[PDB]
Design a binder for this molecule. Structure first.
Ligand SMILES: COc1cc2[nH]nc(-c3cnn(C)c3)c2cc1C(=O)Nc1c(C)cccc1C
Ligand SMILES: [Cl-]
Ligand SMILES: [Mg+2]
Length: 282
């Protein structure tokens, strides 16, 4: 047990399930005194844990994620590590709670409600995810599955990227070709990442272009009507998704630049932050 990060299990009261994926179950919890200012204050957290049927491999993957989160360090636009329970029973990894839930569901709830998102709100969403990715790229972190389902929204509308710390071993091609949480992850993958079986910051920038298209369609599912067995041949032939309705030329330019066939011709995350900042300023 690393004493910097260890929390007593007695400080943690597990609450309701928040969701489940290929990489673990996430449950809501109250953690007492995880805020150093007030060692008796309850703070709501999310706890990542293994499913009951988990293997030793699954455990090593969750441990690898926890250790990777420690190495990467804190940023406003990522789901930060807050602590762990590593001795005395099942591995619990405590991470930030995001009260408005995932970005894809947030956008879909705002197609036809009173909480209509403005253009500026949507550009702010994209800007914040670009800032979190710029940070991750500066720490040599490659996400490998950037998508709006993998971004969380706090009570203050801060965007936080989740599941950036996963091992490459869990991002086998079986993960990308099976449905999880209402999506087929291969539809966010850069063509060369599929073909060469290696991921880079440039393949993450491709996935960011798909995320940007998700934002401006208010949570659309990518490549509407195209069979997944036909997609990558169409991408090689130069097929790209059309401009979302009401999207400006500036934002669609950014999407199209993210999807350049040559990885070296894509913007970096640093450039994307500047480009999205320019849109906010104008
Ligand atoms: C680390 O992951 C999370 C951290 C979280 N912090 N707070 C919340 C949360 C959600 N709803 N409210 C109210 C608070 C939250 C959810 C996740 C999450 O949904 N994980 C996930 C799953 C389960 C499946 C597929 C993909 C992913 C990224
Ligand atoms: Cl999909
Ligand atoms: Mg440019």
């Amino acid at each position: 047990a690393d004493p910097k990060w260890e929390l007593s299990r007695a400080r943690l009261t597990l609450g309701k399930p928040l969701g489940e994926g290929c990489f673990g179950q996430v449950v809501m919890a109250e953690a007492i005194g995880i805020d150093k200012d007030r060692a008796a204050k309850p703070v709501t957290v999310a706890v990542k844990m293994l499913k009951d049927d988990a293997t030793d491999k699954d455990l090593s993957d969750l441990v690898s994620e926890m250790e990777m989160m420690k190495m990467i360090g804190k940023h406003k636009n990522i789901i930060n590590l807050l602590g762990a329970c590593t001795q005395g029973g099942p591995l619990y990894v405590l991470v930030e709670y995001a009260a408005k839930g995932n970005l894809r569901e947030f956008l879909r709830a705002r197609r036809s409600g009173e909480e209509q998102l403005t253009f500026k709100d949507l550009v702010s969403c994209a800007y914040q995810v670009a800032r979190g990715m710029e940070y991750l790229a500066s720490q040599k972190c490659i996400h490998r599955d950037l998508a709006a389902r993998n971004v969380l929204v706090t009570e203050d509308n801060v965007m936080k990227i989740a599941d950036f710390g996963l091992a490459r071993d869990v991002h086998n091609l079986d993960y990308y070709k099976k449905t999880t949480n209402g999506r087929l992850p291969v539809k966010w993958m850069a063509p060369e990442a599929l073909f060469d079986r290696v991921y880079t910051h440039q393949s993450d920038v491709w996935s960011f272009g798909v995320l940007l298209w998700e934002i401006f369609t208010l949570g659309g599912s990518p490549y509407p009507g195209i069979p997944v067995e036909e997609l990558f041949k169409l991408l090689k032939e130069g097929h790209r998704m059309d401009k979302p309705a009401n999207c400006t030329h500036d934002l669609y330019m950014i999407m199209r630049e993210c999807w350049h066939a040559a990885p070296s011709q894509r913007p970096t995350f640093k450039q994307l932050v500047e480009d999205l900042d320019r849109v906010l300023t104008v």
